[PDB]
Design a binder for this molecule. Structure first.
Ligand SMILES: O=C(O)CNC(=O)C(=O)O
Ligand SMILES: [Mg+2]
Ligand code: NI
Ligand SMILES: [Zn+2]
Length: 331
């Protein structure tokens, strides 16, 4: 078995190897990459997402989210308070303000310490889940706006044609902005490209050990657990590495820098934070290996997680028994 310790793998494809996305994903899995839940892909040196970032300041963040924390430093929840719209230029200036900027630090490890010690005492503002793309239309390789669609994968594998579309999303982050412990909708893959700015630190639990993280989460967030049988789908709970280590939960960590791709694998729980002002683009995708994960994916039926038009069809086709109760939560 390849990669039996489930370490995060880092790949350096040549420009030749960067032509066929599906094939490269299948290569990484041949080497065991999915066992970690997360992989880093460093693009060929010749490749670029676009020529410059010089004209992005007029993108609108219609609903910036202020991430307010409750709990203790290593075990907390966050709620998103909606703020007034602002442009990317306005947001960048805010991120660079004395109130919100990254503190002085020695290296990524010191910064990680400061994040876990101090996150809960601040409320950074995240420009998340903005439909759009920063890839130039002429970028042919690993263009997250030109990927094969999940609906087309389901059609190719299963023969059934369904409605729905699959488009990317932009994330504008600042120091301390946080992504809570989650897997993707329908336990899909995700791919995330860090277009610009400061790094993003990731934590991940191997898919084979996801239920260990779920059991810990039920113990640490016991009211949330009683409220919903899949409450990590709400994307609100944080657990620190120290706490995970105290409870024997297998995980790994890695820092993504600008210009790098990360891939999350089906049922790979992940969480993390941004080091400073940055812009990431991400999208879900599927492969044939995903289908079985999609059929087994948990679902939020309490009604909090409230998810896309396109997830309807996935549930309807892969999870027909759940169908019914799940759409009661989404209507
Ligand atoms: O970048 C973020 O805030 C969150 N991204 C992801 O969870 C992802 O790409 O799957
Ligand atoms: Mg602009
Ligand atoms: Ni994710
Ligand atoms: Zn729920």
């Amino acid at each position: 078995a390849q990669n039996p310790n489930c370490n995060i793998m880092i790949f350096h494809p040549t420009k030749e190897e960067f032509n066929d996305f599906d094939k490269y994903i299948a290569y990484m899995e041949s080497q065991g990459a999915h066992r970690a839940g997360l992989a880093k892909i460093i693009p060929p040196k010749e490749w670029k997402a676009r020529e410059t970032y010089d004209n992005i300041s007029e993108i609108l963040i219609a609903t910036p989210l202020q991430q307010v924390a409750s709990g203790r430093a290593g075990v907390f929840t966050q709620y998103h308070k909606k703020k007034k719209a602002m442009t990317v230029g306005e947001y960048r200036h805010l991120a660079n303000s004395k109130k919100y900027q990254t503190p002085p630090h020695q290296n990524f490890e010191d910064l990680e310490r400061k994040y876990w010690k101090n996150r809960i005492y601040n409320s950074p503002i995240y420009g998340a889940d903005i439909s759009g793309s920063l890839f130039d239309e002429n970028t042919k390789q690993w263009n997250l706006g030109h990927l094969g669609t999940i609906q087309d994968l389901l059609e190719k594998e299963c023969g059934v044609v369904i409605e729905g579309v699959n488009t990317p999303y932009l994330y504008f982050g600042m120091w301390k902005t946080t992504f809570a412990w989650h897997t993707e909708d329908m336990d899909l893959y995700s791919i995330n490209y860090l277009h610009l700015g400061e790094p993003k630190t990731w934590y991940v639990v191997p898919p084979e050990h996801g239920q260990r993280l779920e059991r810990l989460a039920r113990e640490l967030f016991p009211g949330s657990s009683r409220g919903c049988g899949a409450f990590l789908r709400h994307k609100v709970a944080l657990i620190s590495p120290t706490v995970l280590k105290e409870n024997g939960i297998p995980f790994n960590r890695i820092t993504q820098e600008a210009g790098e791709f990360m891939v999350t694998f089906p049922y790979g729980y992940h969480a993390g934070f941004n080091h400073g002002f940055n812009c990431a683009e991400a999208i879900n995708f599927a492969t044939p290996r995903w289908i079985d994960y999609g059929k087994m994916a948990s679902q939020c039926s309490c009604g909090e997680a409230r998810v896309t038009f396109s997830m309807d069809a996935f549930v309807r086709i892969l999870q027909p028994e759940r169908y019914d109760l799940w759409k009661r939560g989404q209507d």
